Structure formats: C-alpha cells, structure tokens
Amino acid sequence: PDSLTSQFPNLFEPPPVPKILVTTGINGTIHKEAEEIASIFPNATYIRRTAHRYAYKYSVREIAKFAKNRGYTALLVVQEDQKRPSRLVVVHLNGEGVPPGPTLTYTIRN
C-alpha cells in the first residue's frame, strides 16, 4: 500500500543482516525470561539494564542511541509485572542517517 510505505519507508531495498539487543525494565528480575526471548531471535544478545540496585538508570532513548552507534538494528525491551514478562517493546533503530523508527508495544499475557 502506498500510504503505508510512505509513512514507514524504513520497514517497507532489502533489510540488512539483523542484530538484536534485548534489555528488561529498570531493576528487572526476569533475566531468564529475557534470555529466552533473546534465544528466539538469532543474532540477539541480552544486556541487563541497571547492573546493580543503586546504579545509573538508563533511558530507552539513551540505549537506542547506544545500540545505533555500535551497529545494532533493533532494540527489544521486556517490561515486567509480578516477576513475569508483561510487555514487549520493539524499537526499530534502522541504519545510516535515518532516525530510529517505529516503536511497537505489545502485551504478553500467557
């Protein structure tokens, strides 16, 4: 469709070899679940977000700029609730000079 390709030209020529960064929410306890989400997508690496309880709280804008600079293609953030994964945020970083793209937020139920 012409309207969808114009609004989102990065998603719709060929995509490069993908590279995926998976993080959790701030002070996450779902590391095993986030490692299983990272195992789902090939060429995915899991990096914990906070690195100890009283450490620096990083924003998703900062991590998106970080992974863009170090050659990644998308960022996946797995929010948590009651120590279970609850929301999947998919951030498309894309490449070269085009800005970071669409952010699709889903909810994990079961």
């Binding site: 701030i26 709280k57 924003s59 998703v60 804008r61 609730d81 139920r109 079961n110």
Partner: protein, 194 residues
Amino acid sequence: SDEIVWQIINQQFCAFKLKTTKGQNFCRNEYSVSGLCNRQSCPLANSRYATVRQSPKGTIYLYIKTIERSHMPSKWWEKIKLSQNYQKALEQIDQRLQFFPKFLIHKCKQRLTRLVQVAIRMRRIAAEEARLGEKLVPKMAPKIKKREEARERKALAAAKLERTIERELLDRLRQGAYGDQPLNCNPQIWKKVL
C-alpha cells in the same frame, strides 16, 4: 477562653483530628506547623499562632494569627512573603515571630526548611523523569481483563495452531518454496510430491 476551647478540642471532638493506632494523633488543619495534634501546635486552641505555607506559584509565605482578629475569621491571617534566600527567610521568621513562643519559632523554621528541601527535590525528580521518559499508567481494569481472558480462549480454539502450521508447511512443500532437492525433506518423500 483559650484553654476552654482546648479542652473541648482535645477531649470531646475536633473535625481535624486523625487518630492513628501508632501512638500519635494527627491534625488535618492546613494552618498547623506540625501535622500532630498537641497543645503547642493546635491553631484553634492557640489565639496567637504562626504557620509557613507554600503557594502554587512557588512562593513561601508566613501566616500570623492575633487575638484581635479572632472574631473575624476572614481576617485571621496576616500573609507575609518570605525571601528566596534561605538565610534571609530564616531571619525574616525571627524578626516577625519576635516575642512569640519558641515552639512556634522553632517549628516555623523547620517548616520553612522542609518546604525548600521538597522544592529542590521536586525539581530533581522532574528532571530525571523527563530524561527517563517513563510514566506510571494504570493496569488493566478487571472488566477488560476478564474480557480478553474470555476471548483469548475462544481465539485459541479458533486458531487451531498445530493444524494451521501443518497445513501451511505442506502448502509450501507443494509450490516449491524450498526449491528442487529440498533440505527440509528426505528424498524419497519429495518424490512422492510429484
């Protein structure tokens, strides 16, 4: 009748009291230096009183109650603007609350101190929240949560995933999506396709 008011307030009823089980009582009245209900800090039972308040615009004022404007409740309080410099505001308390009870002077300085400290804390929280970009949204309502729990069981039944995957997989075997000599299937079964 300042004592007679206090006896009615303390031991019969006060609309500002909040009785907690934790060994302390709280005054809900907005013109009280401490939140606690005691004889020193009850503004109703003290004809002469002082209180430090903060305005929505960010200005901190000092309020004064005298025995003369007691029968006039609209004119209870003299409102005096406190300086933004912390030292001049502490001094402005001392000159204005001169010859007051020292409880009122000491707790107004504490109330001035906590109000300035909260304001600095308020600006540090807002700067970090703006950088973090995260807001607390309410979770799902129990009616909506029961709604999609009911429709997920009906959608999982309608999906029939294992038969849907099987049908799609054998469909791509027929059209030759895997090409000649497919790596997905053994050779004698690819011969059965033709």
